C-alpha cells in the first residue's frame, strides 16, 4: 500500500494496520501485502494472487529490481510490462525471447539484433537464427 507524505513504519498492530511519521502525519490502514504471499507464492510458482490484485509495477524508479530483474519467471513479465522498447529491455532481462521475437521484429536497433540471433541460437534454433542473420548481413556466416 503506499504512504502518505512522511511516515515511518513504527511497528505492526494486527491487520488493521498502523503507521507513524514520528507522532503525526499518521495511518489506520487497510492492508495489502505484497511480498509474503509472494515468495511463498512464487516459491510455489503462484501468481494468482498478484494477478488477482492486478498489482502491476516494476518501476517507480525501478521496481523490477527485487528479483524481477533478477527475475523469477516471465510469468512476471506477464503481470506487467510495456513499450517495445521496454519490452525489449525485458526481452534481454528475462531473456524473454518470446517477446524478443516480436520485439526483434519491432527492434531494428541492429546491434540489438546483432548480438541476439546468436544468442537466439545459443538458446536455440538456427532454423530461425538463419533468418535473423539473413537481414543482418552475416551472409558469409
Amino acid at each position: 500500500r503506499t504512504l502518505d507524505l512522511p511516515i515511518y513504519v513504527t511497528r505492526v498492530k494486527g491487520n488493521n494496520v498502523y503507521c507513524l511519521d514520528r507522532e503525526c502525519r499518521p495511518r489506520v490502514l487497510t492492508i495489502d501485502p505484497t511480498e509474503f504471499k509472494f515468495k511463498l507464492a512464487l516459491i510455489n510458482r503462484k501468481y494468482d494472487e498478484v494477478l488477482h490484485m492486478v498489482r502491476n509495477a516494476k518501476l517507480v524508479g525501478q521496481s523490477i529490481i527485487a528479483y524481477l530483474q533478477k527475475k523469477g519467471y516471465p510469468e512476471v513479465a506477464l503481470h506487467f510490462v510495456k513499450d517495445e522498447k521496454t519490452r525489449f529491455s525485458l526481452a534481454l532481462e528475462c531473456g524473454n525471447i518470446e517477446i524478443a521475437l516480436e520485439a526483434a521484429k519491432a527492434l531494428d536497433d541492429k546491434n540489438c539484433w546483432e548480438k541476439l540471433g546468436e544468442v537466439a541460437l545459443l538458446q536455440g534454433n538456427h532454423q530461425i537464427v538463419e533468418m535473423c542473420y539473413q537481414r543482418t548481413k552475416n551472409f558469409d556466416k
Partner: protein, 101 residues
C-alpha cells in the same frame, strides 16, 4: 591458386600465428582436418559453431563438445539453458542413424 599442403603446414604454423580465428579455420579445412578446425575452436570459444562441424562431418565430438558447451550453459543455469542428450532422448545420436560417419 596452384594449391599446396606444404605451404599449408608452415602456414598452419602461421595460421596459429595470426590472431583472428577465422582464416585459420579455412586452412584447417583446406588441409582437410576437422581435428584442427575443432582444436582451434577450443581456444576461441566458438562453441555453438564447433558443435555444428563436429556434427556434420562427424568426429562425434558433438558428444564430447556438447557436454562442455552445455556446461557453460549449465553455468548459466536454467534447465532449458542446460539442455541435454546424446544417444537417446533429446537427441538420439547414434540411434538416429543418419549422415556423418
Amino acid at each position: 591458386a596452384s594449391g599446396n599442403a606444404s605451404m599449408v603446414n608452415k602456414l598452419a604454423e602461421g595460421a596459429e600465428r595470426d590472431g583472428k580465428n577465422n582464416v585459420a579455420f579455412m586452412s584447417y579445412f583446406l588441409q582437410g582436418k576437422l581435428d584442427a578446425c575443432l582444436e582451434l575452436l577450443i581456444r576461441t570459444g566458438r562453441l555453438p559453431e564447433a558443435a555444428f562441424l563436429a556434427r556434420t562431418y562427424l568426429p562425434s565430438q558433438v558428444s564430447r563438445v556438447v557436454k562442455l558447451w552445455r556446461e557453460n550453459l549449465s553455468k548459466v543455469n536454467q534447465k532449458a539453458a542446460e539442455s541435454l542428450a546424446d544417444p537417446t532422448e533429446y537427441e538420439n545420436l547414434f540411434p538416429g542413424l543418419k549422415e556423418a560417419f
